């Protein structure tokens, strides 16, 4: 029985911008809530795509290909599963492979595509596609693959086994500061709890 | 390489801020990014997200949900039980008070993850995802009574561990729902770890 009565714009960026949202709380009383959404979607499905990337090789454990990046809001490095914005027109599909290819270097091949799932939804309306691919690393193509990062991307590939991808992020953490996104973090430890 | 050069407010609420980062970029060229932040953190994080594991003898292992009305999203959401540590509140505290305002259920802790980060390329957020074991055979949890803070309404989804990927693809179908990308990670790895 809840619905939104009005958005008001507080402050636009050219990335992101604050409302002040009123809405009707299921006792019948209007409340209001800090919103916060990005400037840049138009008519896609969800802002952006993350891609779990595994990487299949004969003779080798799969791999999730995860990258490494400074992220200015969080003042550091974080371990996340590749992704990026959706382009005007691009399907979630094309945005995952051609984030994957530019962040890692890698061709991938669809395996499945997730419904418009929330990244932090008491905070802002952000979407993406969870986008599972496969990497033939067997195939020439995947061999010696080169990032192709765009104006102002800086991205270190790690690949980590499926099998032990909990303990070889703990590792990481150990090591160094650096945060791992917390779907990163989700999957691996369903991987254990399975 | 990469480091805060300056940060520049532009909009703050009660609840959320909208700040100018200035970074080095690694070739040592200054570049900005606008970032949100929470004006609420004091804490190992911003927050917790609950992994609720519901065991019932002769029963399916369940995965404890909660479904609200969100705001910034305009609509219903499935997600972990979550809210923000308290000042002086441990993550474990935190975990075990959310679970039982939000569902009833009286858990015990099983692992706590480091701070991971909600949406690194554009919030600072960080939860610790801590997985909690529900003895649902328990009589304090035969019954079990949410105690809903002011203008909190949450209601209780419990889904089989086992089918938890198909169960959540089969509520956005039917109810249109949004399904919490924490949430759809972890039921994607249950799946990928066969
Ligand atoms: C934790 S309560 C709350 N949080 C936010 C935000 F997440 F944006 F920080 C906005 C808001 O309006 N409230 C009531
Ligand atoms: C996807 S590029 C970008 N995104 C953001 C934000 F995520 F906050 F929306 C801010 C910003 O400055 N840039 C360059
Ligand atoms: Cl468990
Ligand atoms: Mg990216
Ligand atoms: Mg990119
Ligand atoms: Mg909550
Ligand atoms: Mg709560």
């Not at 999730?64 to 027109?89: H, N, S, T, W």
């Not at 599909?93 to 419904?115: F, H, M, N, Q, V």
Request: aromatic fraction near 6%; glycine fraction near 6%.
């Amino acid at each position: 029985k809840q619905y939104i009565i009005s958005e008001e714009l507080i402050s636009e960026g050219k990335w992101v911008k604050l409302e002040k949202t009123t809405y009707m709380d299921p006792t019948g009383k209007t409340r209001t809530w800090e919103s916060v959404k990005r400037t840049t979607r138009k008519e896609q499905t969800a802002d952006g795509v993350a891609v779990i990337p595994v990487l299949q090789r004969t003779l080798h454990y799969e791999c999730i290909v995860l990258v490494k990046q400074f992220r200015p809001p969080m003042g550091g490095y974080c371990i996340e599963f590749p992704a990026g914005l959706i382009d005007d027109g691009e399907t979630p599909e094309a945005a995952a492979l051609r984030e994957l290819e530019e962040e890692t270097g890698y061709k991938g091949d669809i395996a499945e595509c997730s419904p418009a799932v929330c990244m932090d939804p008491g905070l802002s309306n952000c979407t993406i596609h969870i986008v599972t691919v496969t990497i033939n690393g067997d195939d020439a193509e995947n061999a010696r693959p080169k990032p192709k990062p765009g104006d102002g991307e800086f991205v270190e590939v790690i690949s980590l086994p499926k099998n032990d991808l909990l303990q070889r992020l703990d590792a990481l953490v150990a090591e160094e500061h650096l945060t791992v996104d917390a779907r990163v973090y989700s999957y691996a430890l369903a991987l254990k709890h399975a």
